[PDB]
Symmetry: C6
Subunit: 204 residues, 6 copies
Amino acid sequence: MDWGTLQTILGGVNKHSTSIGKIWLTVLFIFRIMILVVAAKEVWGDEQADFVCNTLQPGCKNVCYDHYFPISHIRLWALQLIFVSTPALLVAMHVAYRRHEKKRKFKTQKVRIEGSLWWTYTSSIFFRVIFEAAFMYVFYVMYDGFSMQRLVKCNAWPCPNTVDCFVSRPTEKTVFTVFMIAVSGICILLNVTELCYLLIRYCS
Amino acid sequence: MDWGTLQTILGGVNKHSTSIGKIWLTVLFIFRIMILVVAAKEVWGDEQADFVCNTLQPGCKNVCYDHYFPISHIRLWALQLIFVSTPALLVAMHVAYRRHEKKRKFKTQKVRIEGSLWWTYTSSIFFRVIFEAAFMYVFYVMYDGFSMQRLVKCNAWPCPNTVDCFVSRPTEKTVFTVFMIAVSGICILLNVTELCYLLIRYCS
Amino acid sequence: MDWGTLQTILGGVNKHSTSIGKIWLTVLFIFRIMILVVAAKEVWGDEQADFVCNTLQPGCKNVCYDHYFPISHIRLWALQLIFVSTPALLVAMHVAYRRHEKKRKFKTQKVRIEGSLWWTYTSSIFFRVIFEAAFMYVFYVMYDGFSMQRLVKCNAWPCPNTVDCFVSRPTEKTVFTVFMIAVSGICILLNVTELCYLLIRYCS
Amino acid sequence: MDWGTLQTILGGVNKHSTSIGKIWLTVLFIFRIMILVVAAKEVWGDEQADFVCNTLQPGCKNVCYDHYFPISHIRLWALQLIFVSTPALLVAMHVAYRRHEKKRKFKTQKVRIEGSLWWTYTSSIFFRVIFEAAFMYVFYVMYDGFSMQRLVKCNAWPCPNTVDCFVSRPTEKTVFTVFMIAVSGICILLNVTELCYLLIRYCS
Amino acid sequence: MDWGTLQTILGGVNKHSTSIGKIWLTVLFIFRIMILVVAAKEVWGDEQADFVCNTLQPGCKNVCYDHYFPISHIRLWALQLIFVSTPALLVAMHVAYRRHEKKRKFKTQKVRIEGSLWWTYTSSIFFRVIFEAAFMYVFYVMYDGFSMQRLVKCNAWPCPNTVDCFVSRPTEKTVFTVFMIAVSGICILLNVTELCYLLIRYCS
Amino acid sequence: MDWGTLQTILGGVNKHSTSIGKIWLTVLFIFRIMILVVAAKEVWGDEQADFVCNTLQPGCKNVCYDHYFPISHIRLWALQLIFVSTPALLVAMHVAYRRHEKKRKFKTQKVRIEGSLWWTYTSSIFFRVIFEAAFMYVFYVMYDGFSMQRLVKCNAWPCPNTVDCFVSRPTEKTVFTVFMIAVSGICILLNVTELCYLLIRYCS
């Protein structure tokens, strides 16, 4: 996945995740980012190049592909990954800033949420759940479910009447779409349990 | 985004941003640079290859694409990012130079603007606001709003009369254009508040 | 293989493998990841570009390629490598966590499985065997053996009657498929012997 | 811009630039090299692929492109950047060599030109000015100004009579050509002032 | 050759090669891996794209290319390099493991083979010779000598009768094939002399 | 130029070059390797893709390109650079090995050739001159001078009679060929003077 300096970033975030945030970070890096960069991205390489329409109308292929794929699946996943990673990155900085200041004023134990960290950790989990569900909704309603069809019927101008068009690798894209949605749903469940851990402690 | 040496550069600039400059740096790196290199750039990959014109005139596609896209959006964003990052890069050097000299003559506290740093920080914010607004204006008047059309009508020589041409992925490009403009506008608001913080202190 | 930071990751996992896990790590990195990254991936570069069908029907090539290659071989291997590497990555973290805590409470000997590490090492080997056999089963039944044919007969809509189609580099792909399957079978045998080593110790 | 080891190279040259050479280094790295690698290079990607000539003569497109673009603009800029960077790279080594020997025989102050460094610094600036003006002259006379035309008229063999040919992205290339020339002219002015600083000191 | 971390790997293996293994490592890295990465690989880039067959039969080009190039030369060389490097990589670890343990139980001299290292070094040389000769044999009998022909005559189904086909860059591929074979033969001679050095010592 | 770890390699060789070998190393890295990687390589990208022949004979383009470009210019330069760099790389190791042993038995002065280093340095320069002249001869006689022609006349089978073919970017390739030859000739003169420095000392 290129870059090169994960060990600092991956190591930095790892040291500042309480109990489940370490499990969440593994699922995020290995099964969402690694899948996207190593397998999924090349699958969508020829999405418009291999888009085939049964017509002789110039410009009909351009508007039919645009109508049915307003935003690419891989571009949607890249935006979603950036949005869910930001609250985790910000909070991990807060723990390092809180720890450094106390050490300066003054035993590497587990990360504990006791003071001002409560309102930043709880909000970060809330933002992660909201962002994750928002992108799942966009995926469902924009593409009419998680299955890609071989044939799309298009009647936008300048296509005469209805034109038949054919998608490239629809089955492979369905397999990867289901994988991302399922892993995304797992991350939602992981975040909810972390809320349950915190809420019962406050209620107790 | 390749490179590899961000941790020094990102870490260096981060340590020398007062209060909002740290929020500004996050929005710049994560939501402007990361989007451009990971999602936006591949969207514009086939801008001229998939440009289709309904004509038989040789050379008509070349002049019509040039007329309606004098400079690509991604090339415009790359220039804008370079121009806004330079004042921040220079001032971060000034803080490190001011701090180092005092240490040589001789408590890592927050960055404070008290002496000659006042005329460099204030000018840096002023330049960033001016650069940000200048590029937003160029985007609006060159492309006639932030929405990309499916069809462009072209009558430049040697095209006979008016020729219909069709843009590649107009909807995807509109979505990313709105995202950059919205994030660019947020950075303008963040810079203005930093001016308000400094101006009231001087007025007090 | 790009990346750049194996030496930390490869060095980290190597130091925490008992006797056979060091042989397993060599076979995994050198004969599965190196083969896929350096040789296999470019073999599948033109899988659909050089797919040729004897027909004049628009859209027939798209549905016939999708029917016979629902998921690419290289994308299947990438998923399999990620799934088998995860249990080994997790357990290597457990050994480092178990060792670090003892040092904090307080002779670099070989890795020994005596306490809570028994239920994590044994499950890690069990998961690796199950994952390895599941992907070998998918390879066999999805593609009807490990040999790729030169000609595939396709009758899916919209292809009229049965259409003859021709695969790109079928012999090269067969050679690499047999190589990956054989190395995958070796890793299964290596894991089973490690179970035999542990089970006799518990039974004794 | 790939590479990865700038921090050593950029850091090394930065520490050995007197007053203006630090401003010169910023303009060189940020507005000449960064522009070339991030924006300019992809603009010239399809210079010959999208070169279109209104003719049926085989081989006419090859000789007409060669006639009007004997050497590409980006390749010209790459050569110019290498030539201007070499004198600065060499002199920066001289300062480090002069400083190291004094330390071995034996207060990090500003770089001062007093002894044998006078004839190396002065010649380095002179070579940089001469190289910069020579490449600006080549740009002007080879391409007949800094504006690229949409249409070129070609009559070289084997093209029959005069053939009309059309350039790819002429407006975008004009924008980047004007930018590089203007920044190159700024570097000339910066170097001349450094000569004025040194010459008055010697005359005094 | 991309990667980035040879200096650790190259430095590690270099420090653990007796007398000729240092000469062997230079020939392997510089004249086998560097040539393949930098020069040879791009020569085979258009092997099937520029494969031309004088026919109108659909699918005839696919089966004729497959028949005459079952596995590409560059893919064959990549497999051979991996197989010959593994015994050297493993033995270098044994020397470092033997040296480290004795130091822990307890003068950086030359590498000496006296104890258990005898059966690992001798087998490593034997495996390297066997692997090198096996791949040379495969190259000879698969491609009928080391010279690539311009024309190949193909009669496999569905090609009607015998079809003439033309290879891309046959002369350049012949030059690089002879270079690898000659360098491969040198490595065989180097390994044999190392056996002669060891065998006479044991016989004495 | 990718890679990433020149600073160790470039720094290592730099510290072990007597007087002229430092100038030689600069010319080699900056004006031979930099030019080839950054400018020359992309010029030859479409050498066969844009090779155009005025004919209807299938396979005629393949044999005519092969006849007139048996080895690519860039592939020739890559081989030459590897051959000339090897003697300098080997000798730099000898200086470090000779120096390290003295330190172990035991004032960083200039590199001096007094003992066994005489027969390795002198042979290294002799090999470099011989290799440099050998590749100059191959360039001249294989391509009939250093100027590339627009038109090549080809009569090899299966081309009927003589076929006219047209080269891609012949003028740009001539400019870079002359540059490499001139810089290569400078390196020959630099090596000869180093022989003159050594020979007079021995004769004295």
